[PDB]
Design a protein around this nucleic acid. Structure first.
Lengths: 56, 209, 114, 120, 121
RNA sequence: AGGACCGAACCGACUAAUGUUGAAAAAUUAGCGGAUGACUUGUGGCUGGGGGUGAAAGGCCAAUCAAACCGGGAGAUAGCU
RNA sequence: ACACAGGUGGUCAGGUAGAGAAUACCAAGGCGCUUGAGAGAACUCGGGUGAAGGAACUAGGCAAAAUGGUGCCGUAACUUC
RNA sequence: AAUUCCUUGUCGGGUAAGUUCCGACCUGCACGAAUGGCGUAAUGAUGGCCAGGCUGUCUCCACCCGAGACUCAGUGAAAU
RNA sequence: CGAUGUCGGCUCAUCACAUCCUGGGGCUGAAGUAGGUCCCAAGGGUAUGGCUGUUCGCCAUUUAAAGUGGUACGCGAGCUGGGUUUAGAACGUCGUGAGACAGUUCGGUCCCUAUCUGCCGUGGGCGCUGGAGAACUGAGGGGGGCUGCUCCUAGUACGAGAGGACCGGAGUGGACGCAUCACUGGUGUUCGGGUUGUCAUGCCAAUGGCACUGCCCGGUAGCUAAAUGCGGAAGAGAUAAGUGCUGAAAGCAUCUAAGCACGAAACUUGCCCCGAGAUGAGUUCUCCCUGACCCUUUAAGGGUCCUGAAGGAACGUUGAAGACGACGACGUUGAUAGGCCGGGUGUGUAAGCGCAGCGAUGCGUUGAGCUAACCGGUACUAAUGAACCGUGAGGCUUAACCU
């Protein structure tokens, strides 16, 4: 339930070796407006693949 | 003797004339195409690698496409192997599948079993649950002891605990062949074979027989 | 599937008459003692399945010698060669378990194709 | 464990799911585009598209069935007068899910679900 | 059928209600009776009968609420569990007449005599 | 009529489960006992520590009781750690 | 010690069903309890249903299940009547 | 026997089987008459035993519905 | 003693052999059946209850047998808390008394979110020497290993009779394990219906909310056991106890010293599963990449431009796969999911209208309406093309095959 010896900062970093964020590294570019977006998502002005889908 | 690769169509019933109503599994066995023959010169053993079914030619990668392009190109859903021992058979992909099972009487069917996920000890092994009500703080389906105090001081390397159940290769042995249909590409065997509907089955003649 | 129900339809029998639950039917079944085989009749009210293809079964409940005998039969089995309509009963539901666990109460008859 | 089963619990009981989807189906029929989460949009597809399919045929019995569902006479009237004949030549797919960003208060994958042929 | 199961009695000299106290055969036979032989104490009897209340003997299960399985897949169930009382040594029926239906699983050896006395098989 | 009966408010606390770094330094949930009486409760008063009070358990006396708490003798004493 | 599942005296007392201040659904009125979104493993907690058997469980019928209302009939040993 | 060590005394009943129970015997280690003796209707969240009903208590677990546990975002301890 | 929780039960076990059963034998005061004793052998198996807190013991009934021990008299950061050693009370006894009993009796709080090791599962990274996509080999490792009864041989051998075989075949069970959902069932708060109280949709009618899914009645798919299939073997090899052949030492005898032949559920294989991180990193098949320079301390590299290949990953639709990762299918050249259509199923004759009746209600339309996770189809909706990662012929030495 409790520890008998303090884990060192080496073992702390070894456990956090998999606690690492991954980036998108590839944004899609819409074909009507040149702005970028997440793949398969609305293009933050209301564009999907070539169509103005949401007016706001 | 070599076997074949089929898929599990499902289970049904064969009503015989005496009213015996034997439970059968239907295995669709399409024609197996010998894509490779392995001998004692290239390898240390003799076998045939076959394929079955079809793939849509866009999910076939270029190494797979070249491997199928050798020895006659009809791509299949996978590749399997059967080791062959004494009899010699010629090395082209067969036209009718189940005609070598037409004269056998019992088969072993290997299939990837249905996955039960993370299963407990009571499901995975046949562990007795503890008491439901006589006291029993928080300990009904949990495992009890897992060892023997200080003298081992450890848990042994084969201890039955919870974990992944199913989703594994498993063979049911000596299943009686009920019907062989060359025209419908069907093998009806008596009983239940591992896996779900549409899963691949390696069906071979019985080694215990 | 399509591969199955081909086997089921080539094993199914087409001589099965129309029955509803609450009907009192008589079922002739083949019984075998030695080398001889004969027909034995089982008569009673029906707690049916509706047609599950080849895997169809009707329950028939009888009172034979003072106690209830409940027997299901597979409809397309070869041991069941004749099912006779006999009485034609009138109930409101599909399974008659509550309407059989009591004794001395019988299903009524109506003539609206029941 | 969970084999060949449909329906998301969405961490609520069945009566709350039914009332929540009655409300959200009424919101979709009212506004013709709403913003919800992605699982609550796919389950909304499963709830809303049978209503438009029911409302393709105009009967008193169908109006009472589509009022027993969604419990809103204005939603029934719109569903049987504007929708229905609008989607009469369509065979399914009356709604479209467009994946959107993420919610600010919690990282919820959002989605706009809308009627496919909006007259706007 | 199972241990502590209270069964009715099909024959006449055997009387009224009995209790299964062992399932004969096997190391741990758990729930067993189709035409199987069980060990019996007697919980209720009649003054006329050949057996008293509280003596151990054998019996064969002739009717079971769980039922039997026919080879074609069909089931023959009964309302209530019944048995025919049998002697300990020779395993002969005590009774001279059998009441109620029996089942065609009961055709081996002495159960020929039981179904010969039985009304419906 | 009744230290009557059943049963809410109210008073209590027999069993079980949960909680045991709790939602809570004793509670919650499902039942449970009394419920016109030796009942229960508000407000105020009185009894003060070898003392009080106790249908009595050494119970209770401010989460403290085989002698309360605070301050002092006091840096008691400690052949013990 | 907390924006704490506890404690805190009195007063008001709607509709329908109901003996009822029980209980259920609602008035007037007030809230959704200051983390959400998914997914649908073990295991834990709180429940629902179970074939056949029916206390074989266990220290022990612990727990659960069961019975449950009004009117009428009927009701034993024993008794301080 | 809230009392008996030997002791699971012995006999009878209950059970297929009963160190507990009930009725006796008296061989009371070591009951006994207001430290009260024996009995006693009613009463008891009292102790032991039996039976009917009832059931997941069990044979022997199976499925389902919710709150967690698992993943994601925000905040963020503890014993040691 | 700045704390190593104590009996018994439950759950889970693991080892020893001084073996309970099964297996193989020697002697018998072994006719046969059935025994007695000893040797070998640990592969598998090795009860349920009544009483008691009990281990044990006795009893009842099974079984092939209900083994003996070690494991902190195995197992309390797994459970219980009946026993035992807290605080209350009483009895018997002792004490004048407070109190006490290797006496009894009733009641009496069992905490811990796992850091390390150890296990059970499941991933990420790098390595395996150009990089990929698959299929394998099998060094190792694990699982499984039980057995009753009946029939034939044969009422034979044997035995005065009674009784009753060995060896060898066949069937059918019990326990156990694996798989599965065709059957029979359970569940099925996502399907349909009945019904109570109340509230609401203006009201009737029809519905909806709440009351445990309000209470129920059935029930699809999935999961499941009680359901249904299958399995533990045969055969080898080397043996233990034991039995021998030939055969001297020792002219004989002698299973042994040389040589040779049998011999068990033990051992190695045979059956099933994992398995090249087997760093000893293996094998086979297939695919892809064969451009310009510049600087240089060269047991060698570094940089710029051009080009990103095989393939993978990411994203999305998802799955009888799954905690998350992983694995599988599909992404418009498309049936991957939802919808839709048709069927199937499951409830049980919807609503509205008409008729009969004073009415509740019944009858006709009508096996109606609704119907899930099922089946067969169908691009209606969503699966966008980029983009990302991964490069540009792959070291040294030696030996063979080549000019």
């Amino acid at each position: 339930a409790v520890q008998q010896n303090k884990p060192t900062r080496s073992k702390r970093g070894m456990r956090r070796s998999h606690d690492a964020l991954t980036a998108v590294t590839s944004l899609s570019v819409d074909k009507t407006s040149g702005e970028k977006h997440l793949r398969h998502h609305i293009t933050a002005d209301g564009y999907y693949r070539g169509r103005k889908v949401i007016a706001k | 003797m070599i076997g074949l690769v089929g898929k599990k169509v499902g289970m049904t019933r064969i009503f015989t004339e005496d009213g015996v109503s034997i439970p059968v599994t239907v295995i669709e066995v399409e024609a197996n195409r010998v894509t490779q023959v392995k001998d004692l010169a290239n390898d240390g053993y003799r076998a045939i690698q076959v394929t079955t079914g079809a793939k849509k030619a866009n999910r076939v990668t270029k190494p797979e496409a070249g491997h199928f392009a050798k020895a006659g190109v009809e791509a299949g859903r996978g590749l399997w192997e059967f080791r062959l021992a004494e009899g010699e058979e010629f090395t082209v992909g067969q036209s009718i599948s189940v005609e070598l099972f037409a004269d056998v009487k019992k088969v072993d069917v290997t299939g990837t079993s249905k996955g039960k996920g993370f299963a407990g000890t009571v499901k995975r092994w046949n562990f007795r649950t503890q008491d439901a009500t006589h006291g029993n703080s928080l300990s009904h389906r949990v495992p009890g002891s897992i060892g023997q105090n200080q003298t081992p001081g450890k848990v042994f390397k084969g201890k039955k605990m919870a974990g992944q159940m199913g989703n594994e290769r498993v063979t049911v042995q000596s299943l009686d062949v009920v019907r062989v249909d060359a025209e419908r590409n069907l093998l009806l065997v008596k009983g239940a074979v591992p896996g779900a509907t549409g899963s691949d089955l390696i069906v071979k003649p019985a080694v215990k027989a | 599937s399509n591969i199955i129900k081909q086997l089921e339809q080539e094993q199914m029998k087409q001589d099965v008459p129309s029955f509803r639950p609450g009907d009192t039917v008589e079922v002739k079944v083949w019984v075998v003692e030695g080398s001889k085989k004969r027909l034995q009749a089982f008569e009673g009210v029906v707690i049916a399945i509706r047609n599950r293809g080849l895997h169809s079964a009707f329950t028939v409940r009888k009172i034979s010698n003072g106690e209830g005998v409940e027997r299901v039969f597979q409809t397309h089995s070869p041991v069941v060669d004749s099912i006779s309509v006999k009485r034609r009963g009138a109930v409101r539901k599909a399974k008659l378990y509550y309407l059989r666990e009591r004794t001395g109460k019988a299903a009524r008859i109506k003539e609206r194709l029941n | 464990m969970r084999h060949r089963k449909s329906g998301r619990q969405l961490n609520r009981n069945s009566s709350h799911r039914q009332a929540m989807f009655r409300n959200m189906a009424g919101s979709l029929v009212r506004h013709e585009i709403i913003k919800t989460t992605l699982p609550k949009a796919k389950e909304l597809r499963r709830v809303v598209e049978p209503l438009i399919t029911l409302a393709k045929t105009d009967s008193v019995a169908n109006r009472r069935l589509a009022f027993a569902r969604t419990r809103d006479n204005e939603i029934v009237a719109k569903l049987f007068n504007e929708l229905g004949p609008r989607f009469a030549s369509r065979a399914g797919g009356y709604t479209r899910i467009l994946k959107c960003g993420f919610r600010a208060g919690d990282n919820a994958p959002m989605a706009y679900i809308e009627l496919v042929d909006r007259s706007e | 059928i199972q241990e502590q199961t209270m069964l009715n009695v099909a024959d006449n000299s055997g009387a009224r209600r009995v209790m299964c106290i062992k399932v004969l055969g096997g190391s741990h036979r758990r729930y067993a009776g189709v035409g199987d032989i069980i060990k019996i104490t007697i919980k209720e009897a009649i003054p006329r009968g050949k057996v008293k209340k509280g003596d151990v003997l054998k019996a064969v299960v002739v009717r079971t609420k769980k039922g039997v399985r026919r080879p074609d897949g069909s089931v023959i169930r009964f309302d209530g569990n019944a048995c025919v009382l049998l002697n300990n040594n020779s395993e002969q029926p005590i009774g001279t007449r059998i009441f109620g239906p029996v089942t065609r699983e009961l055709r081996s050896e002495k159960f020929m005599k039981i179904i010969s006395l039985a009304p419906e098989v």
